Design a protein around this ligand. Structure first.
Ligand SMILES: N#Cc1ccc(-c2cnc3ccc(N4CCOC[C@H]4c4cccc(F)c4)nn23)cc1
Length: 280
């Protein structure tokens, strides 16, 4: 039984506090991965135990400053658990909306101002997501559902790529098997091909999400309508909050031919530079 050693955690050391969302994520304390400690815990046939073990091995290998930190599993008894660091500001899409000009409530937090994010800040969020993507492309890992709903925000506005998904985001998938069509490129919709270049397209849509403070791409349109748009070559419009240099980077992610799309490495480098010195 060769493979990656996955860290195991005794059940007695996991104390579940409350559900945060629905796989079915709870907030918990864990002693002692250090003192005692807050963590996020995902709860779940032998075929499932197979995917569990498999995904666990994979999660163990993919470790990077912008990938949500994975601590191990608990498999003594049922249900099976995956243990992750806790990202106190939840998912990026919800975070964005709560700092949008549209938000109905004020979003306290000692570590960020309520109200619209600074441009410097939006840029930092995008840079961080890209860095996550650079790492994954490096490993030839293809993420088939890149979107702010699958990113996590932690203390100090650290952003990491996570996982799905929350039932509140069902509207973001189209039932064919559920596809995130609004984030998919023509070659995915047309030919069912998914590549690192497909992820670069998705990331472009993530950029649009960030600079609209979390709006659904093509929110005015039905699923088939959005598919017509994507395949017929229509592009999402520049967000009001989005500077030309960034819209340019977006457009580059959206080349109809995958090979003309800029590399994720390139994309990240530009965003990081914009970020270190935000244009007016
Ligand atoms: N695999 C996996 C995995 C990894 C980490 C986490 C995690 C760590 N800190 C938090 C805080 C809130 C939270 N949420 C917010 C909404 O309730 C569901 C859950 C979630 C589920 C699906 C996708 C999300 F980006 C976030 N998740 N989370 C959750 C799942």
């Amino acid at each position: 039984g060769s493979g990656i050693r996955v860290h195991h955690i005794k059940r007695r050391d996991i104390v579940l506090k409350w559900e945060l969302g629905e796989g079915k994520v709870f907030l918990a304390e864990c002693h002692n991965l250090l003192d005692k400690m807050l963590v996020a815990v995902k709860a779940l046939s032998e075929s499932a135990r197979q995917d569990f073990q498999r995904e666990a091995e994979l999660l163990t290998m993919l470790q990077h400053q912008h990938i949500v930190r994975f601590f191990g599993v608990c498999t003594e008894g049922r249900p099976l658990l995956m243990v992750f660091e806790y990202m106190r500001h939840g998912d990026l899409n919800r975070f964005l909306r709560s700092h949008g000009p549209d938000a109905k409530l004020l979003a306290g937090g000692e570590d960020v101002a309520p109200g619209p994010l600074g441009l410097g800040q939006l840029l930092a969020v995008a840079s961080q997501v890209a860095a996550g993507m650079v790492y994954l492309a490096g490993l030839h890992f293809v993420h088939r559902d890149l979107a702010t709903r699958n990113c996590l925000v932690g203390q100090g506005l650290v952003v990491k790529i996570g996982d799905m998904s929350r039932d509140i985001y069902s509207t973001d998938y189209y039932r064919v098997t559920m596809l995130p069509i609004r984030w998919m490129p023509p070659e995915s919709i047309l030919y069912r091909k998914f590549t690192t270049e497909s992820d670069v397209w998705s990331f472009g849509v993530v950029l649009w999400e960030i600079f609209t403070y979390g709006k659904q791409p093509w929110y005015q349109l039905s699923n088939t309508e959005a598919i017509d748009c994507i395949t017929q070559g229509r592009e999402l419009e520049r967000p009001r909050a989005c500077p030309p240099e960034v819209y340019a980077i977006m457009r580059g992610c959206w080349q109809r031919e995958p090979q003309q799309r800029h590399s994720i490495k390139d994309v990240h480098a530009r965003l990081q530079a914009l970020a270190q010195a935000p244009p007016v």
